[PDB]
Structure formats: C-alpha cells, structure tokens
Design an enzyme around this catalytic site. Structure first.
Site, short mmCIF file in Angstrom:
data_model
loop_
_atom_site.label_atom_id
_atom_site.label_comp_id
_atom_site.label_asym_id
_atom_site.label_seq_id
_atom_site.Cartn_x
_atom_site.Cartn_y
_atom_site.Cartn_z
N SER A 134 -8.02 3.12 3.58
CA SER A 134 -8.44 4.03 4.61
C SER A 134 -9.15 2.51 5.11
CB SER A 134 -9.27 4.20 3.29
OG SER A 134 -8.52 5.66 2.76
N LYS A 193 -8.55 3.53 8.35
CA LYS A 193 -9.21 4.15 9.69
C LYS A 193 -9.67 3.71 10.30
CE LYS A 193 -8.92 7.24 6.05
NZ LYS A 193 -10.08 7.82 4.24
N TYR A 247 -14.96 13.43 3.00
CA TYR A 247 -14.12 12.12 3.33
C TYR A 247 -12.96 13.37 3.45
CZ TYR A 247 -12.58 7.66 3.08
OH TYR A 247 -11.63 6.29 3.59
N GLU A 289 -18.54 2.50 9.20
CA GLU A 289 -19.87 3.67 7.92
C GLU A 289 -20.43 2.06 8.55
OE1 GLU A 289 -18.74 4.81 4.99
OE2 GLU A 289 -16.72 6.11 5.88
N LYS A 298 -16.26 -1.04 5.81
CA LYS A 298 -15.34 0.44 5.45
C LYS A 298 -14.30 -0.09 4.64
CE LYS A 298 -13.28 4.00 6.06
NZ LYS A 298 -13.27 4.64 4.56
N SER A 335 -8.57 1.65 -0.20
CA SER A 335 -7.65 1.99 -1.30
C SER A 335 -6.27 2.38 -1.11
CB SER A 335 -8.57 2.08 -2.45
OG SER A 335 -9.97 1.51 -2.68
#
Length: 353
Positions: A58, A61, A145, A267, A308, A311
């Site tokens: 991720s 992203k 999420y 984030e 961030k 996995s």
C-alpha cells in the site's frame, strides 16, 4: 554515530520479527545514507543492498495519489467530480453520487478493505463489481481503509488522462521523478534484484495478480529509488511545474481520525508525537471510523510527520518524512512484520536525528 543509531533501531527488531532482509534509506539535510541488513534471498545467499527490489504494498497508494495529482494539475479531473464522470460503464450506478475525493480518502460509504475473492483481475468483473455496489452509509461520513476505493480513484485518474494506469506510471510518472529502479511489472533483466518474500514456515511469497493491483499495491522498488521519491516529496519545487503540483496535491489534509490527518495517499501526524500514538494511528481497527472534516483542506507541511505503511503477504514497508526538518526515511523488509514494529524502528531513528 548514524550507523550506531540505525543499527540499534533495526537489529533487535529484525531479530525479534525474524526478518531475513531489511533496507533502510535516510535523507538527512539533502544527503542520502543507506543501511542494508541480511538476505534478499535466504536460499541463494543474496544480500540486501540499496538496489534490492522489495514489494511496498500500500505504499504504492502514494504513487497512485501522485498520478491523480498530475491529472488534477492538467485540469483533466477535479476532486469534486462525480466518480462516474470518468467511466461511462458506471453512469447510472451509485458512483453518480460519489466524488473522486471520497474514493481517494476511503469515505465513499463502505467500499470494503479488499475486493471480494469473487472479483478476479478482469476488466469486466471489476466494472460489474462497481456497477452493482451500494453504500452502507452516506459518502463523506465514515473512513474505511479500502483497496477498491483508492484503486478506483487511480483507475479513474488514468481514464481522465486517456491512457491505462500502468502505462502512465511507466512512461510518464516514473521518468518524471527520475525513478529507474521502480516497477509495476519487474523486467526479466531486473529480476536478479527482486528480493524473495517470506511468510509462515518461510514459505516464499511474491505478490500475484489481483483486481486493481497496480493502483493499490503494485510497486516494487529499491530503498535508493523510494528515497528519491521521498526527496521529490520533500522538495516538489525542484521538479518541472506540473509534477511539483502533482506532489503538492498529496500534501493536503481533508479530515482527521484520531491523531491522523488524511491526505491523498499520505497520512499525517503532528511532530513531535509519542511512539504509542504513531503506532496506534498505524494499527487501525478495520471497522469504519467517523471523520472530523476540516473546514478547508490543510497544507501538510512544517512540524508534521507524513507516512505510509504497506504490506503484501511476503513484505513489509514503511516510509516517513518530516517536511519542516528535511528528513526522509524508508524501511523495506522481505517479511510482513507488524506495523507497530516498523514504526518502532522509524521512531528510534527520527527521534535520534
């Protein structure tokens, strides 16, 4: 002294989590530092280096969000667009009532953590999944999420630019950011650098195909390349202006959940913050959370940590940077070890610096 700091943070966590190989890359006052540990492949004794490729899951992203920032910079889309604007197959579906911002920030109204196993990597199956989907609660209200959520955001961003997502990333975004060791589909020539992933009983794991895998978790990259991407995030002003704007778009906060401010991909936390709070923010319960929406989008700069986790079944990645301190950090491992442990290493290093 830096080796001592990084070794003291990494070595016990690698031993406690049985991590075969781990690469650290640090950007400190404009200078890169690399710390490589262990084995990319136990079976052939191939050591981790700063050029070893790891799955970043991720963390992909943040790349997907940057491509969307590029579409925004070119006025090919706007975050208040209805999602179905960018895909005729969705016109008349509930995506007529859902914004691109809602998809990017997991507030479309209950898109699940993963595609159901019934949805294979197939254009028609993905299309039909979104056509039939109905929200559980109002768009804009609750964060859950979701790979389908930000996956559709990336897919629609690619449609707004008139080309497939994977092509745009390979032909436009990776070259624009100077990333020659970053891949969605690793070339046969680079496979020697592709670390093995390890699961239960050291079963070997490299990620297999899945719906919108490129958008949600497709990136394989080196610690050296992912630090180049962190350095582009620390200094967008050094890039050609549309790409500077693309990166800036990922540094805008829309709402808070607990201590976390949600941007596109990134984030954010206030800095300083306790380790336990940064672990809790990265160890989210996988039920919906009500959001505290910001009166206006907030610049994610200064005394903040942007981060961030990501996995796959075989790999565990973490990236963090502090804009106001010109500090960047990448931690890539070939085991999926708990988020709290990744944050424990990073916190030891960032606090140390």
């Amino acid at each position: 002294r830096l080796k001592a700091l990084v070794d003291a943070a990494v070595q016990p966590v690698m031993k406690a989590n049985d991590i075969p190989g781990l690469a650290v890359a640090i950007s400190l006052k404009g200078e890169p530092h690399y710390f490589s540990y262990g084995l990319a492949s136990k079976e052939d004794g191939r050591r981790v280096t700063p050029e070893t490729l790891f799955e970043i899951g991720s963390v992909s992203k943040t790349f997907t969000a940057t491509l969307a920032g590029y579409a925004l910079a070119q006025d090919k889309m706007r975050l208040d667009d209805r999602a179905s604007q960018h895909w005729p197959a969705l016109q008349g579906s509930r995506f007529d009532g859902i914004s691109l911002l809602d998809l990017a920030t997991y507030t479309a109204g209950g898109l699940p953590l993963q595609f159901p196993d019934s949805v294979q990597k197939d254009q028609a199956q993905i299309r039909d999944y979104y056509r039939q989907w109905q929200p559980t609660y109002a768009p804009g209200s609750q964060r859950l999420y979701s790979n389908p959520s930000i996956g559709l955001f990336g897919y629609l961003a690619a449609r707004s630019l008139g080309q497939p997502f994977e092509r745009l990333m390979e032909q436009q975004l990776f070259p624009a950011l100077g990333l020659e060791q970053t891949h969605l589909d690793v070339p046969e020539a680079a496979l020697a650098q592709y670390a093995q992933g390890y699961g239960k009983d050291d079963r070997p794991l490299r990620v297999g195909p899945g719906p919108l895998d490129a958008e949600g978790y497709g990136v394989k990259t080196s610690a050296a390349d992912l630090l180049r991407f962190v350095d582009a995030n620390l200094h967008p002003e050094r890039l050609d202006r549309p790409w500077a704007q693309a990166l800036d778009a990922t540094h805008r906060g829309y709402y808070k959940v607990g201590d976390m401010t949600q941007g596109l991909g990134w984030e954010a936390y206030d800095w300083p913050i306790s380790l336990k709070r940064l672990q809790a923010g990265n160890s989210m319960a996988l039920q919906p959370h009500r959001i505290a929406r910001l009166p206006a989008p907030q610049a994610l700069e200064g005394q903040r940590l942007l981060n961030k986790t990501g996995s796959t079944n075989g790999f565990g990645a973490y990236v963090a940077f502090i804009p106001g301190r010109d500090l960047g950090l990448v931690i890539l491992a070939n085991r999926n070890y708990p988020n709290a442990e990744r944050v424990k290493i990073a916190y030891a290093i960032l606090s140390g610096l």
